[PDB]
Amino acid sequence: GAMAFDGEDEVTGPDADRARAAAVQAVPGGTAGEVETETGEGAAAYGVLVTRPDGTRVEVHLDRDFRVLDTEPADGDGGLE
Asked: From CA 53, how far away is CA 42, in angstroms rounded?
């Protein structure tokens, strides 16, 4: 259909807009936040953080063309030190 490359003007992030807009259409009234660019070299270039009100947070990994690669539940217990 419509390719996710436009550019809403109310955001400060490039991919943060394109991927977020697609996320809103996938999650019914769920928690959606602006996304940041993941590692350039690889398959997943965009990480879309979304959370269902059920208490489940999943990050949608998008490829170079914003095609859904896979969705795994994202937790925050893995620190680094």
From this structure: 31
Identify the CA nearest to 8 among candidates 47, 31, 34, 40. 34
Distance, CA of 20 to CA of 49 (rounded, Å): 8
Give the start-to-end residue ranges of the domains of the chain: 1-81
Tell me the one-letter amino acid at 60. Answer: V
Among 21, 78, 17, 26, CA closest to 51:
26
Tokens of 23: 């996320």
| CATH number 3.30.505.20 given to 1-81 | yes
9 contact partners, CB below 8 Å, separation of at least 6: none
